[PDB]
Amino acid sequence: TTSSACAPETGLQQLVATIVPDEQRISFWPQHFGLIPQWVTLEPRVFGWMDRLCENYCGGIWNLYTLNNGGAFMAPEPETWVLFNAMNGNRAEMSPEAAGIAACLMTYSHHACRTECYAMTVHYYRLRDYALQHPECSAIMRIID
Template identity: 60%
Template sequence: MTTATKNNLASAANESEFELTVTQIPDEQRICFWPQYFGSIPQWITLEPRIFAWMDRFCDEYNSGIWSFYTLGNGGSFIAPDADFDDKWHLFNGMNGNGAQM
């Protein structure tokens, strides 16, 4: 699955438009995701459980689950939890008071 998203970036000096391609990693390639994109980070193997723990800490509605892995056309990558239906999650960081809805 590949989707493209257009975003408008505006600054005081100029405006530019760019297209960013997002591609979901197939299940059979997930095993290579962490070492391929984060292998240069010391102890990269601990990143996934840490991400899950932070999500659990920030979001009362989160109770573990399946996460999808993605790559970006600009060489970046990210993971995101799979939501059921149109679930909205409310995140709150008690350490600094920031909150968001996802």
């Protein structure tokens, strides 16, 4: 509910993303990220990373999602996009959903290092685990490497 520091489970766990209802959309960022400095800027920062990564036209309609390990992210719904990261020189082709996961990972890791806020670090580890279980894990890990 609040992306608490307490783990729902330890050990091995099947991770699942669930769309945030339209009713609860507006409360998403403070509810899950409100302990982190500059949380109101995270959504703009994700779109910023997506613009850096996108080779030509990406676009889409973006939704908000929660994870059953306490994580949370934004992406288009689960057509392919080509991304390119200049920091590592890699190109990768992937679904709009996977691209969104990739943009959020980059956002969370960068912002954790800037703020030294462990709550941001935990969001990174939680989404990273979802990426590690994802059918397009190889492409996601390639682009963020």
